[PDB]
Nucleic acid binder design. Structure first.
Lengths: 78, 102, 97, 92, 92, 98, 81, 98
DNA sequence: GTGCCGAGGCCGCTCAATTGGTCGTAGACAGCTCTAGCACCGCTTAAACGCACGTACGCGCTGTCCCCCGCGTTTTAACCGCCAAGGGGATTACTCCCTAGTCTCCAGGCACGTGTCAGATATATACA
DNA sequence: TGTATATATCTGACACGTGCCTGGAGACTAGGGAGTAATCCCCTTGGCGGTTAAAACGCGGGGGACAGCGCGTACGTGCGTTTAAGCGGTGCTAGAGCTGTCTACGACCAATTGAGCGGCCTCGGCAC
């Protein structure tokens, strides 16, 4: 499912940061960097869910997992 | 007579004192003196964010506080950016354009 | 019969997406990617409705913040267009690698 | 059941900007900021009693964690605003 | 008076490399590494019970905090080594 | 009579770890007996992992005692041991990169 | 104890650059390295004063430097005991 | 005479300072710098014998790690000599203000 | 190979590990109530893939200043060891008065239902 | 041709005010944290004047930085039109959450006897 992010989807993300010209090989590199960062948050949410003997990832499992990495996100109960 | 009106603060004193005794530690004791100073720090930090966010709302002719104004007030200030190092959901970043891209 | 200069159309999108607060990445392709990665750790996993919006807000904020430091490396090297090698340079200083 | 600060944030806004309001999305942003600060104040003050061989946490441990978590500037104004309610609550 | 791990670090080294030794400058590095890990294990396991409405820290909380702190690989080997001493201590 | 560390086959003290846990976290909580045995195996496995890589590199520099310099190369040289130990060893230097 | 910013000489910064992998060093590096180190030193020294005044002491002990460096993110070993 | 080329002498210092774990910054000039900063926070302050060495080990480790990320910006910009403008670029990614 | 001060192994002292016994109240797991997760029906129209052709960033080559390396006389002030006087850290004994813990009294706080205006749609004109 | 400004509209959702139940507040007594003085003697700061590492000023000339002419291929802008995002919803039943009962297994308390801290001494690792 690595083909979820299309080409114009990555271009829209670079316009917010301040990137004018985007190379053609950026779409091939952005998918690899995002997959590495996503592997640390998804795996951390599985361990937090199995500790409570639950099979459904709740909304609080993502907040408690992102606090240890440093990217604290608000607006989701904490 | 509640302990919040006697000290001149809006934060609950009994709630902060009850929460502090349920964290750390077992041998540690949290008296009534620590609850008064703890409610003053949370109230001053709350009014400081609402003051900078409420000033920018008067430019767009709006009434309710939007999450977009909360990001421009926290990230735009050089004193509240190092303290609040989180991420506001639904606010974006500060619109900045470099001089080498024009 | 009427074509703009290569640079005026790209500069108009900077002042538009920076003011909006909606999500840039869609919800359907992003939901299928989370279920695939989580399937390797625990099979037959489920996600709540609010759990999808929490992961999308952190993924978009991380990609936007990373592009800010990545574009600074191109201007510092007397260039304008970003390069794939500039991502690994900023990730090494931050501590990701 | 749900112990939050949804009734205390709107009271402070009415004292400074009475001609303003709040939304459902903006309520969770201000509520998460207060909970994150309280977790850092109680966490920093807990290590002060253990490192100094103490136990009773009074008003001296709360003021110590203010100047440590804040890089000055705003930390000076919190000292005058914190001690104003301590003397008023005792001498009453 | 001085509760440290100066007698337990040298005992593990004798079981692997008996033809080696230790110094005073190297003992402070190994003693500070165990103290820093123990402060992170107890700190991570404390939030596992409060967020799930619990009040007892058993063997399930220590194993849960291992995979959360270790970036895999070495976290898998600690499960087989941790559970080996738990069953041996109970079934004895 | 019989120590708790000898029955479980570990070198770390079990009574010292269980005693220090009750004074930290938490207030109105209790520390289980099974948590002290599992915590002693984590500190023992991490200690032997650093001493294993440091003892092999120290045998090549015709030295017997473990120097603080070899302890830095055994941690910073390993990729898995670099992200876990994010501190700074006093008197060890860095990896000779050129 | 006045104008002690001239303690870091020119060859003192050259020894620190060779450990990382810096070949040639410019002339304006000495004017910038002294300002960067002064900013970083102002966060650890100030944090040690607050930790010392809490114990009603006047001398900065060795334990106050380790507790102040752990909060900033630069944990230093060896000086723990 | 026996004048070496400008380049073969600077490379020898990289393989020498990276092998020894000695202190690069002196102790006497660095002691007066710490007392000047701590003079505005609290007057009549003292420092122990071990407190001075702890601050010196952290200052050398911070300057070494800062020069590693700064030297990488020169190779990306097709340069060799470091510049003061390259130091502010690496400090912005880590989050160091001012 | 030649010299000096830290590491390994002993004896002795006394903090706190380990046993047995009694009983509070955490949490294992029995069944029941009903939120909101997963899969699939199809119309409307945003946005993704494919690809035409100039436009203007990245590329490499090579001047010519004026960057700061490399080597050596003279110089400022660091490291070395040892002297004497007194700041303010250490653990050591006593009682004031902080704040943990038990019932009873009665209001702050917070779930659900209720009006009507904040600010989101997308039609207008007038400009940047 | 491209973003703001303007009056109009639409119905989701913020603010208001009760119904009722925890969990804030107050008087009281029990007992241990740490008030703030009273002690000995750790190891900070300041003093002098030797030796000899390494800091500072100045020399000549290699090879670094980065101005600017111009080859040639990657990617900006936009017409045409592939195929899957998102909207209106309806049915089935996983497994989150709240409330029961009564056994599994830590805390507290109080006499034993061995783990391990502090101070000694003899090499025998590794510094010049």
């Amino acid at each position: 499912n690595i083909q979820g992010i299309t080409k114009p989807a990555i271009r829209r993300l670079a316009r917010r940061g301040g990137v004018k010209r985007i190379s053609g090989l950026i779409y091939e590199e952005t998918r690899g960097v995002l997959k590495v960062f996503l592997e640390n948050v998804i795996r951390d949410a599985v361990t937090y869910t199995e500790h409570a003997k639950r099979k459904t990832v709740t909304a609080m499992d993502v907040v408690y997992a992102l606090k240890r990495q440093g990217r604290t996100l608000y607006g989701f109960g904490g | 007579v509640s302990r919040s009106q006697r000290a001149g603060l809006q934060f609950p004193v009994g709630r902060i004192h009850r929460h502090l005794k349920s964290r750390t530690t077992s041998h540690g004791r949290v008296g009534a003196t620590a609850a008064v100073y703890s409610a003053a720090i949370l109230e001053y930090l709350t009014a400081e964010v609402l003051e900078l966010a409420g000033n920018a709302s008067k430019d767009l002719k709006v009434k309710r506080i939007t999450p977009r104004h909360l990001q421009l007030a926290i990230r735009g200030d050089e004193e509240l950016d190092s303290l609040i190092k989180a991420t506001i959901a639904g606010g974006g970043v500060i619109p900045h354009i470099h001089k080498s891209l024009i | 019969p009427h074509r703009y200069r290569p640079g005026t159309v790209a500069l108009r999108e900077i002042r538009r997406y920076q003011k909006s607060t909606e999500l840039l990445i869609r919800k359907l392709p992003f939901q299928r990617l989370v279920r695939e990665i989580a399937q390797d750790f625990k099979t037959d996993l489920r996600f709540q409705s609010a759990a999808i919006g929490a992961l999308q807000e952190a993924s978009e904020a991380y990609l936007v913040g990373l592009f800010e430091d990545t574009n600074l490396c191109a201007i510092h090297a007397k260039r304008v267009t970003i390069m794939p090698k500039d991502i690994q340079l900023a990730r090494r200083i931050r501590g990701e690698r | 059941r749900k112990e939050s600060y949804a009734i205390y944030v709107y009271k402070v806004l009415k004292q400074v900007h009475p001609d303003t309001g709040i939304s459902s999305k903006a309520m969770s942003i201000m509520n998460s900021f207060v909970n994150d600060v309280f977790e850092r104040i109680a966490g920093e003050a807990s290590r002060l009693a253990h490192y100094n061989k103490r136990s009773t946490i009074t008003s001296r441990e709360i003021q110590t964690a203010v100047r440590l978590l804040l890089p000055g500037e705003l930390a000076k104004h919190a000292v005058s605003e914190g001690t104003k309610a301590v003397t008023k609550y005792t001498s009453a």
